[PDB]
Amino acid sequence: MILTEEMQKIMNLIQDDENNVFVTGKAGSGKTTFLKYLIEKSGKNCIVAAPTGIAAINAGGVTLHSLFGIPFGPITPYDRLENKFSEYKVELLLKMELLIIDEISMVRPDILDTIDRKLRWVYESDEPFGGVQVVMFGDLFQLPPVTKKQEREILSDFYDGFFFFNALVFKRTGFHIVELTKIFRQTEPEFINVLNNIRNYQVTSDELDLLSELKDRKINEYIHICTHKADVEKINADKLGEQEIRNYDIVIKDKFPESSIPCDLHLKLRVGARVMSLVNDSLKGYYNGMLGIVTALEDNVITVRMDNGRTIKFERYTWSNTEEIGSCTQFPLTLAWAITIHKSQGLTFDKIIIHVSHTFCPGQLYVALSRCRTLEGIVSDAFITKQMIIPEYALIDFERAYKSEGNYYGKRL
Amino acid sequence: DMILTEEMQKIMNLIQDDENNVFVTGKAGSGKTTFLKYLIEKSGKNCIVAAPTGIAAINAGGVTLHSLFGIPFGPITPYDRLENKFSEYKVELLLKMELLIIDEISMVRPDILDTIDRKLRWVYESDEPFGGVQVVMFGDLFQLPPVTKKQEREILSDFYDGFFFFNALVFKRTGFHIVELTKIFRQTEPEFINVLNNIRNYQVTSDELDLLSELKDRKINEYIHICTHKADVEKINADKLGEQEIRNYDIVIKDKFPESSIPCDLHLKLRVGARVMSLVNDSLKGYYNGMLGIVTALEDNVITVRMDNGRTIKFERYTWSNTEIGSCTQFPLTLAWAITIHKSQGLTFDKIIIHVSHTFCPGQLYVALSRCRTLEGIVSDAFITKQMIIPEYALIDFERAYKSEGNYYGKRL
Amino acid sequence: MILTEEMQKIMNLIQDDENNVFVTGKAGSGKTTFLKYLIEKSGKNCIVAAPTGIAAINAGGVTLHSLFGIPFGPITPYDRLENKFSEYKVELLLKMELLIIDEISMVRPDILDTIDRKLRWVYESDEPFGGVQVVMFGDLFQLPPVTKKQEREILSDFYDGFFFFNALVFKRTGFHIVELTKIFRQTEPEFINVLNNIRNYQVTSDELDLLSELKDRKINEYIHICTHKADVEKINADKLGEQEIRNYDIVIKDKFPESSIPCDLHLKLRVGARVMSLVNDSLKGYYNGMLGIVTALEDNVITVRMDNGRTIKFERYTWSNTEEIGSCTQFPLTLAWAITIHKSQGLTFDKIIIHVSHTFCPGQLYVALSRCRTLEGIVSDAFITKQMIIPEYALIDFERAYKSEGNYYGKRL
Amino acid sequence: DMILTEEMQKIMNLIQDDENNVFVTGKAGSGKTTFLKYLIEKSGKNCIVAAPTGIAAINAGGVTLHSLFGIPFGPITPYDRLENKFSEYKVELLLKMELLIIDEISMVRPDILDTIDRKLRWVYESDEPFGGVQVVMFGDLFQLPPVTKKQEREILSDFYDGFFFFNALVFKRTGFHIVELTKIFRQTEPEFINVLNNIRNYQVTSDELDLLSELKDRKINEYIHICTHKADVEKINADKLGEQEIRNYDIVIKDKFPESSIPCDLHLKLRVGARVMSLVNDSLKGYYNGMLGIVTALEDNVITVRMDNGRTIKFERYTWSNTEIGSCTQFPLTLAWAITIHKSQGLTFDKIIIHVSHTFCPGQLYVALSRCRTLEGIVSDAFITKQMIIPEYALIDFERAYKSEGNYYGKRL
DNA sequence: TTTTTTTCGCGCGCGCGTTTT
DNA sequence: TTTTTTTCGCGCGCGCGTTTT
Ligand SMILES: Nc1ncnc2c1ncn2[C@@H]1O[C@H](COP(=O)(O)OP(=O)(O)O)[C@@H](O)[C@H]1O
Ligand SMILES: Nc1ncnc2c1ncn2[C@@H]1O[C@H](COP(=O)(O)OP(=O)(O)O)[C@@H](O)[C@H]1O
Ligand SMILES: Nc1ncnc2c1ncn2[C@@H]1O[C@H](COP(=O)(O)OP(=O)(O)O)[C@@H](O)[C@H]1O
Ligand SMILES: Nc1ncnc2c1ncn2[C@@H]1O[C@H](COP(=O)(O)OP(=O)(O)O)[C@@H](O)[C@H]1O
Ligand code: ALF
Ligand code: ALF
Ligand code: ALF
Ligand code: ALF
Ligand SMILES: [Mg+2]
Ligand SMILES: [Mg+2]
Ligand SMILES: [Mg+2]
Ligand SMILES: [Mg+2]
């Protein structure tokens, strides 16, 4: 691992200055690698979180929703929060000196405000975030936070936009913006060039021509990633096959809409199947997004050898729909040869097959291509076109604002 | 017919070097207390044996820590003044001692160990930890933890990072090796052992617990009743006592003595043939806290009991002091067909009836089940469930720390 | 009031000797008058009770069932008692030094044993009645305790008879028997003579001839008393009339057999109606058996001027049938021109009309006649015959036993 | 326009004889505190005024008993040693005093009066009760009783037959007359008064309580909120405070000071116009415990308040001691739109909102309702029921005792 | 069109509401 | 066929289980 001069300056900033900091940079600029270095070398008590389970594991932490007990759905400044933290969690949050959030680009502003409110409650303080110093890592030109149209309508009454920096807490505090400008994941200068111009919406037809060889390229080592969950399910079912399959049915109890069920209705597995854990269970040593391989199937237990070498015996898990109207019980596992691009953000691969024939988020195409260390390792189902790129001009405005104002956003303290 | 294993031999040879403290640990029934007695018999050192409970002390051949070291009740801080009122007999015994042996260390508070450190340094007029005495601790942190109330923990929390023996402040100035015995002797059934072990470490599954389904209401005075709660113990003892030929002995209280602080029975009810336990130590008369016997005669002021160890003892009334404001006088005996799980820790039985429908301590269910040599010898009032298992995550942290640092904890010398 | 030599000897016995005492004597021998004197002059803390509400008021106390929280129905030595005493009641019973029970002849043995068990519970003692000294007043040749045939069958498995002295506590303790032999209520020697021979079953036809003038004697001052509740209801309804009547209906909620309802189904009242309270409410100043006159009737309040001068506003009361299956709500009042002979025991009147054409209890005829200060004040509906007298030969045996054994019954201490 | 009644004149003339203590009592709003001020104005005696609560003391023109006599918290037994640390100013004031005036005596513990007795006898170097000072007590035993926890009562129960002021041991060596004021002035509606009176003495009926049906959710900053619970007070105060232009002042705690022992606000939140109350006495600066005012300015270290009495005061931070182990520093102010019923006792209002859905003290409901001059001025959150009434039977006994013994209690001199 | 929580538990006890230099 | 109970209450907190000369 190489410690660059940019990284050294940021280390010294964080040690000398308690202000919040946004550490940003293009795909594969070493942000998560540097995150882990910062903690190891800092003398501070650090807690690591991320918006998705996979990204959290990649950073060595847990989801924001788990750490802070955050409910699903949009949270307005007038909603009352249930403060039901255990004493271990209160103590952990009080002991914490540095809150580290990775992949900040996918964090909603009301999530950050909920964290602010919950930390101020835990600390019994009026200081933003309870006085904890916050260091955020990510790339706003990758995927934005997941919001449904109805949620955006509710939030639009209080928020001028749907990115983390729109949080109301940044009227009372702010952060420096620093950037890492050396690419490490890729080494080919022309591949990097097209990536960068996709990222900032300034790619030309001629530059995208470099990627013509991706589509239907002639070749279990290749990882599939898809824009759509429906595509993920088809690819996973194909790779699963019909040899030696066991089926495990969900048990639903009372109210539980089918579109709200967090798990598989009919979990179909075989020995050798690539799977992902859906839930966190620190007692059993597994966490949301951890990957492994099924090694045995029984009546009430599924055995999976995790990538980290641990063998785990999974039992069924019970979700609540809330006030407990209905519940559902099922093994917390799902097939995982294919994954969404949203879940892929943060990971690195040598060989990938991307399914981007229909993109619908800013940054989605950019994230998909930038997972791979080399150009030759990408296969595509479709020619790469400018129509796959969706600009978000509110991000141009944001960067223009802080870059012309001393690389700082929000209330100066 | 006592097997000396290779693990036991290595520990003997380790201890030879009178400069490194050692924690000898291992699962229930791995021969820990058996090996303690071997170490002493074969060592050339002057050894003293102690344990936190009277039953465990007798089982190890020693006395309670509170009796040996004159320890008061309630939390002791490093700033509390200790009464150093040892007789010359006791001072001489402690000066002659070369090896302090503590069994069932898991139930020893950290402030208890520090009080022992302070008292031994006073006796030895030394600044060396424990007065220079070598300390060998025996037990299993995954059995019952020390009994503490929330208020006592609150006082201690200003000085201690946790409430286990290894949190003692003396282990900033000294430390100990950790060694383990990994062969189970008490049980012989491999599948029974596997369920015990997986209950112990919080990773038992529903399917494994199905092995224990036959415990509840199993069809069969040979069975020993072991209960989570003292109130249940009292009910079972009164049933077995019956109403035939009962004699009652009332406590005499003199002045101030809260009823919740009385150490003995308020109304001691006995008959010839009753199974009883001594509550106090009187080495001159040959009886000790936790010793078991059978009532052979009842008189106005004398109860004759033939002890299990073959001695016949004539018990008279004993006088406790509450400090001197008030006192209470009563025979130091109590019924003992039934006992608490806390009192059972350390003992072995062939046939038991366990009352674990309500467990409230980590390790409580594990201790209860692991007393019995065979599965068939256990009867339960309730199905055994995961809700009976209570994790103590401070123990996971502790084992992770010492296992990665050479099986040693505390200040390296 | 005259203090006789018999009374003086009993006073000195009770002061010098903590043994229990049965104070007995014929009707109108001053027992209840002397009871009140004993308390006034004793230095002991005394509590007064009686089996019926009227008798309790006459003695200045409360019913045994209320004082000790006794359920209805027979209580066997194997039934478990609910010990649900308030702290005031526990303290009152602990403060009590002398338990005084009037009209003991109507107290069942299992009631006394329940009191024994409850007092031993309150005092945490094995001494009979918790060590309290018990002084009982009454006349075994008056009415016996009320028992139904089914209750007698249950009790006959444990009890050799159905009088208070058959209680099992009198195998562990006993009492002196003393007697008052001077009649005060009546002054006519020949009236006294016939009363006495009715009482002891040795009246002759010629002696009963003295009472011939009672039947249909030519004359609101006369009080009616009846053997049967049905007769009481008819006489009360006659005297109530149909002028200016208001009706108040019971509200029954769920399970409540009509033969188990403690109150009136359709309470019919008018201003001027003679009524009796059915329940105790010390807060409002009224108690079971207290007598008064209705002064006003409203929608939800009935106003009664009690004999003691207090004006009371009665609201509806709610009984429980038990575990609360059903309940009933009603004003705790009932008409009371007529009363049963059982309720009359203990009271004195100048003028009475007795309805004894059908008697069914030993002592019933004797109690009815002996309420009146003079012979001329009695009117009867029927000629007085030997068939109205029902001997209980178990009482002859009892008196023979104690009179020949030093006027003591039970275990001598 | 203050009416001097014949009852008041007789009490004035009674007191003239400086050798008989007097208890002046009467129902809520009978002019007791008004007459107190008259007695002093017209008496030629040197009078000192005190009360158990700060609000009541201000209402009577005096100071708290704890401040006047330097009384520690917690129960004081006759064997506890008192710190007699009075300044010469205080000693001289107490020596000059001729009449000790105590208002709201119902909330005064008996051990408090004995501490005052002991301290005055020390100051006067005398064995005469209260040092020979004449004591006149004002209050209503059917309002709130003194605040005691069960543990404090347990300690005191070894020496005291009850927990009201008249149980003080000094009343074995002295006594007092009881006089009463029986004309209500605060209210004028006879039917409203009748319901107040019948709630007060535990004899209100359902039909009488029907008069109060219109209280619940009555349609209307003029209304004062009075609550049973401090937690409710805090909620109402925060609502009225709002979130416009709020300044927060945090407590500074230094070392040992349990959070449940802090006398002030942890986070004092204020704005200009906020209704506040002083928490401490500083006679030099002209403010006293319970004095009410309005915030006029907020600064870093100074809050300017125009008091109700016309004085403008500049409050600085105050330092409490916990004994010296730890201390806490904070402005001695708290919001006071809402107040507890305990703090309201003694005050009069035209318009109130009472929160009595959960009452837990005798007299609490009565005090709440009786603050208001008219029925229409009361709004309630709940229907008024008999379950809100809590009898204290020790008061019935007390009134029975003194009323039958010449309206005098204690040792007659 | 895309993602995302929560460390054991039944039961009795009794606080609640006040107050210093 | 005849007589006879029980003094406020919702809610949070946390014990439980141990131990001297
Ligand atoms: N300082 C570095 N030295 C060497 N290789 C690096 C360095 N930083 C990143 N890399 C490589 O590039 C990859 C990018 O890591 P990561 O921080 O997860 O991506 P991003 O920079 O987009 O957050 C790493 O997996 C690593 O292989
Ligand atoms: N080396 C050995 N050979 C034979 N039996 C043994 C050996 N070690 C222990 N045991 C048996 O295993 C059981 C465990 O008893 P004990 O040592 O008191 O509990 P623990 O091992 O949990 O301290 C005892 O019955 C003992 O006889
Ligand atoms: N010692 C006495 N002196 C005068 N009159 C008495 C005396 N004892 C009883 N009486 C009269 O006789 C009546 C009997 O009283 P009581 O004791 O109730 O009846 P009993 O003696 O049957 O219990 C009293 O009401 C009273 O009028
Ligand atoms: N003699 C009087 N004449 C006129 N008003 C009076 C008289 N006595 C009391 N009041 C009024 O009755 C109300 C009762 O107030 P206060 O005396 O403080 O309460 P309490 O009487 O309960 O001590 C006050 O508003 C007071 O003005
Ligand atoms: F954090 Al990245 F690609 F932006 F792994
Ligand atoms: F650890 Al053991 F009996 F001493 F299980
Ligand atoms: F007690 Al009676 F007649 F026997 F009044
Ligand atoms: F007794 Al008051 F206001 F002083 F009701
Ligand atoms: Mg990253
Ligand atoms: Mg052992
Ligand atoms: Mg009588
Ligand atoms: Mg007043």
Numbering used by the authors:
A (entry chain A), C (entry chain A): 4 to 222, 228 to 330, 342 to 432
B (entry chain B), D (entry chain B): 3 to 222, 228 to 330, 343 to 432
Task: Quote from the publication.
Helicases are modular motor proteins that couple the binding and hydrolysis of ATP to unwinding of double-stranded (ds) DNA and play essential roles in nearly all aspects of nucleic acid metabolism, ranging from DNA replication to chromatin remodeling. Pif1 unwinds duplex DNA in a single-base-pair kinetic step, powered by the hydrolysis of one ATP molecule. To reveal the structural basis for unwinding dsDNA by Pif1, we determined the structure of BaPif1 in complex with a symmetrical dual forked dsDNA and ADP·AlF4−.
We crystallized BaPif1 in complex with ADP·AlF4– and a symmetrical dual forked dsDNA containing a 10 nt oligo-dT at both 3′ and 5′ ends (designated as BaPif1–10dT-fdsDNA) and determined its structure at a resolution of 3.3 Å. The asymmetric unit of the crystal structure contains two BaPif1 molecules plus one DNA strand, thus the model of the biologically meaningful BaPif1–10dT-fdsDNA complex is generated by the application of a crystallographic two-fold operation. The binding of BaPif1 to the 5′ arm causes a sharp bend between T10 and C11; consequently, the base of T10 points in the direction opposite to those of other oligo-dTs. Importantly, the bending in the 5′ ss/dsDNA junction breaks the first C11–G20 base-pair. Another notable feature is that three residues His236B, His377B and Phe379B from BaPif1 bound to the 3′ ss/dsDNA are juxtaposed at the helical junction of ss/dsDNA junction. First, the BaPif1 molecule bound to the 5′ arm initiates the forked DNA unwinding by breaking the first base-pair through geometrical strain while the BaPif1 molecule bound to the 3′ arm plays an accessory role in unwinding through stabilizing the first broken base-pair and engaging the second base-pair in a pre-breaking state.
